[PDB]
Amino acid sequence: EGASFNLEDSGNFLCTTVAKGDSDFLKRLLSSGMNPNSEDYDHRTPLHVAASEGLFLMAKMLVEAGASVISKDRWGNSPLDEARLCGNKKLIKLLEDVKNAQSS
Amino acid sequence: EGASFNLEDSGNFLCTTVAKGDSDFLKRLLSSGMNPNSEDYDHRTPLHVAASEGLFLMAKMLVEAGASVISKDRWGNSPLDEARLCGNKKLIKLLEDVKNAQS
Amino acid sequence: EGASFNLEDSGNFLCTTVAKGDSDFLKRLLSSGMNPNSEDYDHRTPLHVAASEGLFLMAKMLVEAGASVISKDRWGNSPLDEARLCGNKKLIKLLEDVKNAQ
């Protein structure tokens, strides 16, 4: 029927969901695809939160939803920067390649 | 009756509520004794959000609730430090006074 | 029923309420029909006081109500001038956007 949350701050609710860490909840949400990424009160997209948290599965799944890596938090840090800070090889490679491609 | 909040992620919900910016509604939460020390997934206190955004009044009441200002976030900046980054002289003033009390 | 505030020294009361800093009280006040365009005896709008105090959330409520950004104070200073004195860059930006719109 064309399911779409379209909730108030649904992307910010995804920031709160990455705070929850429920990858299944997130997968079903992003299957409904309410929002790819949206800045939180810290101006951090849910991709920022996942990348800083090292949640590579959630971050890759958000990138599949459309969470951009060129977005930067309140302190001008992209999710790629957070992933590089974390040091997650798979997540670092994913965000490096995706953001470098996104620049073009 | 002693009914408490018992609400999941009190810190993150407080960050969200301060983000809304309803000073009297936060005050009503405080009349229910709302969680003084709070933090979201980025370890950012609602004090952090208020100070980075310069919400001096919200931070004023929240600190009145007994909120820890020396507490820092994922970035290692306290709400005092976040206000210093934002340069809210009045908010820096209040947070510094309460910190000198706390230190 | 068409309630109107009809309260003496409305601008002065609004400046004093900005001094109170109760954002919810002012939100409900100016959303109940009161106009914050009115200034005080010092011709300072409540927007003037908010901008000098750097009360961005409070001044944003104020502007949405209709508090003039190009109105001057007793000393001939706009709320934009008050924002520049405060040092709040973002407040300066929205006040400049409003002056251009107005």
From Swiss-Prot, chain A:
<comment type="subunit">
    <text>The potassium channel is probably composed of a homo- or heterotetrameric complex of pore-forming subunits.</text>
</comment>
<feature type="repeat" description="ANK 6">
    <location>
        <begin position="75"/>
        <end position="104"/>
    </location>
</feature>
<protein>
    <recommendedName>
        <fullName>Potassium channel GORK</fullName>
    </recommendedName>
</protein>
<feature type="repeat" description="ANK 4">
    <location>
        <begin position="9"/>
        <end position="38"/>
    </location>
</feature>
<comment type="function">
    <text>Major selective outward-rectifying potassium channel of the guard cell membrane. Involved in regulation of stomatal movements according to the water status. Assuming opened or closed conformations in response to the voltage difference across the membrane, the channel is activated by depolarization. Conductance of the channel is modulated in a potassium-dependent fashion. May interact with the cytoskeleton or with regulatory proteins.</text>
</comment>
<feature type="repeat" description="ANK 5">
    <location>
        <begin position="42"/>
        <end position="71"/>
    </location>
</feature>
<comment type="similarity">
    <text>Belongs to the potassium channel family. Plant (TC 1.A.1.4) subfamily.</text>
</comment>
